[PDB]
């Protein structure tokens, strides 16, 4: 198992700190993103590409990834695939 | 045991962070959902399909899932 | 050991998050239930059936079960 | 080792969440009970019988048991 | 190792929750006792006997024991002696 | 596995306290840096060189490293 | 490894609860002691003898010991 | 692995409580030192010798060491 997960373009997240990884489509997750953007808890790791996963950490940080949600989770074991 | 659980579509939840997984059929759980919506703690992972399970995590996040609660808990092992 | 306990009708609780499971038979736990209801911390998982166990979690959530307390704790295995 | 201890009549307490288990025979503990009662943090698991143990958990819940402290702690196994 | 320690007359304390066990003689510990007595965090487990150890737990509870401090600690392994 | 990671020039970070390590190339991260600077929570470990990684720890400390994120995470071993 | 450490006389400290053990020879540590005294977080286990070590635990308790810091840390193993 | 690290002159820190060990060479860490001094969170363990490492603990304590950061982390073993 990987302690740090690559969420795209070299950016890393500690697996032990993730609560949930989800699609950005719905309105509750978009409110969460905007609240984080406003409280300075948002991390944008998409490197300009399109957001495909929103990672919520236990410290109310919100991390935007260009990698799809389950691919992020799969990377806990080293590949995009499980 | 999996540490991340697919709760429907590609949405993942860390199993260690779950307090309870329940059906949304009662007034108290509905109050919990509305409260989480209003405070920016709701996560909706149903992709529009009907809510079958409500997952309460430990940071007071509430996650709506389209999968039955018992099916969510079995995915801990596969 | 089961990490999630079935508390009736497919509703699940994480065993590690339980503080106490008790009968709903006393004034203090009923004050705990009504407080949870007013504060939006109550979870009713009885599926319309008697409350036979009150589960208090470490987040001040209060979960009503149709299964009796010792039965809940025995389903840990 | 049990994760859940039967504190009498099928009422369960999580052993890891217990701070101390004491007899209810002193003024400081009785104030702890009264405070818990007023704050909605008291749980009464004595099923109508005399209190022989007061269990303090880490969430400042206070749980009354009809079983003496030593017997509560011995049921960990 | 004992998970619950007998601090005298059947009263039990969880070993994992103790921060410190100390003699009651000095003025800083007596202030701690009186503050706990006033905030309802004091537990008197001496069963009327003389206080010989003050146990401080991680939740700011203060527990008075009739057993001497190192005897309390020794009881982590089952006897008054190590 | 190392408990402490060298983030450059002999500066050490505890691997278990890291939440995320990211590049400093986006507006949201730069605000995180500026907030940390104003709050006395910023640590600058770049020894005078360009920032290539921003490490967020669980105590909301923010630590600037002259080493890219992937290289920081790879030094766990 | 011991989980309880004799810090002098019969006074015990849980090793897992210690943040740091230092000599009291500097102004900052003295401020920490006075602050703990005033807030009811000081524990004095020196039995009057001179303070050789200051033990900062994780609930902001400060414990004065009559034993040298390094001697306190070796008693973790004996 | 050593549970306590000697940071110079017998002063000890618990390795599990360290967030980061860094050189005192930048404006942000000096703001962290002075804030700790004003708030009563500073611990000076240099024994009157140069500060060569600043150790930030998870309780917002700040510990000044005469030993260089990488040396502190190497004494973990």
Author numbering:
A (entry chain A), E (entry chain A): 2 to 83
B (entry chain D), G (entry chain D): 2 to 79
C (entry chain C), D (entry chain B), F (entry chain B), H (entry chain C): 2 to 78
Reported in the publication:
Here, we present the structure of the RemA homologue from Geobacillus thermodenitrificans, showing a unique octameric ring with the potential to form a 16-meric superstructure.
The structure of (Gt)RemA was determined at 2.3 Å resolution by selenium single-wavelength anomalous diffraction (Se-SAD), because no appropriate search model could be identified. Analysis of the crystallographic asymmetric unit showed that four RemA monomers arranged into a tetramer reminiscent of a semicircle. Thus, our structural analysis, consistent with our biochemical analysis, shows that 8 monomers of RemA form a donut-shaped 8-mer with outer dimensions of approximately 71 and 35 Å and a central hole of approximately 20 Å in diameter. Closer inspection of our RemA structure with the aim to identify its putative DNA-binding motif(s) or domain(s) revealed an extended, positively charged surface on the outside of the 8-mer. Moreover, this surface coordinates three sulfate ions (i.e., S1 to S3) originating from the crystallization buffer. These sulfate ions are primarily coordinated by the positively charged arginines 50, 51, and 53.
